[PDB]
Amino acid sequence: LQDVVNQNAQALNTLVKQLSSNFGAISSVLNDILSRLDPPEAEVQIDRLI
Amino acid sequence: FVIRGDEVRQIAPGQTGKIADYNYKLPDDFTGCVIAWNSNNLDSKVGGNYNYLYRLFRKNLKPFERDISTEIYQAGTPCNGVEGFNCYFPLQSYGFQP
Amino acid sequence: QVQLVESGGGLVQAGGSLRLSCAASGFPVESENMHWYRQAPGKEREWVAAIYSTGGWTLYADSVKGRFTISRDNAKNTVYLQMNSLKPEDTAVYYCAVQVGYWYEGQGTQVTVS
Numbered sequence: 652l653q654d655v656v657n658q659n660a661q662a663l664n665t666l667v668k669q670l671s672s673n674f675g676a677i678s679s680v681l682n683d684i685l686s687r688l689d690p691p692e693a694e695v696q697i698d699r700l701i
Numbered sequence: 702f703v704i705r706g707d708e709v710r711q712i713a714p715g716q717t718g719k720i721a722d723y724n725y726k727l728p729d730d731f732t733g734c735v736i737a738w739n740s741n742n743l744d745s746k747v748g749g750n751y752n753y754l755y756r757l758f759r760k761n762l763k764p765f766e767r768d769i770s771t772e773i774y775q776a777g778t779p780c781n782g783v784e785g786f787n788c789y790f791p792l793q794s795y796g797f798q799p
Numbered sequence: 800q801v802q803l804v805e806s807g808g809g810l811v812q813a814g815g816s817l818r819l820s821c822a823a824s825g826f827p828v829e830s831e832n833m834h835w836y837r838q839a840p841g842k843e844r845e846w847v848a849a850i851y852s853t854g855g856w857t858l859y860a861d862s863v864k865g866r867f868t869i870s871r872d873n874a875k876n877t878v879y880l881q882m883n884s885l886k887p888e889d890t891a892v893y894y895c896a897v898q899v900g901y902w903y904e905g906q907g908t909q910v911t912v913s
Contacts, residue, residue: 747843747844748844748845
């Protein structure tokens, strides 16, 4: 039971950590990307993050 | 329409610029194209050709709009529709010369 | 026959006040956007002003801030140009150019500063 709980917790934590990865983009937060870049390039970055 | 040399790059979808934001807007999903040809023998005259005008001051345009109104632009004491401080003319001419 | 006649030019002292006039007949003036044409000895011909359709919308060059005043006779399609606070280097010859198709410009008029 402890192993199952730990696996679920680490899977959720891994998902949350992966949520904050650049994936080859300028930044890991889309607000900063929108504030910095232009419509087309920011759209490309958002598509890669997506 | 008629534009200048460096204005060609601004006539394109997704390209930023003063003219590309206040005069003519191309949609992000634009389908079509642009044919530009030099008219130095027709639109240019000795002494300066000033028939062609472009908006200079504006608060943004969505794709494919026409803004024929050129009401005076307020930059922030308001001048109340009179040329003076904190407000300048919204249109500017090109002044093409040979 | 579409023609231009010039009026108002002549010798003047700095600081005067007069009417300058280009009278043309045979076509409407609100049809398009005319401009004005100045000649002085130098590099090339030098622009002054032009007004546009749908309102006066008078535009002046950077060296002519707030001096020329224009009163405008819409009933009988006539120009009136009105000069203020004259200083010397603008000794020139004046034309008024309009568009109805072919390129058109008249004979002009002489203006001097003493």
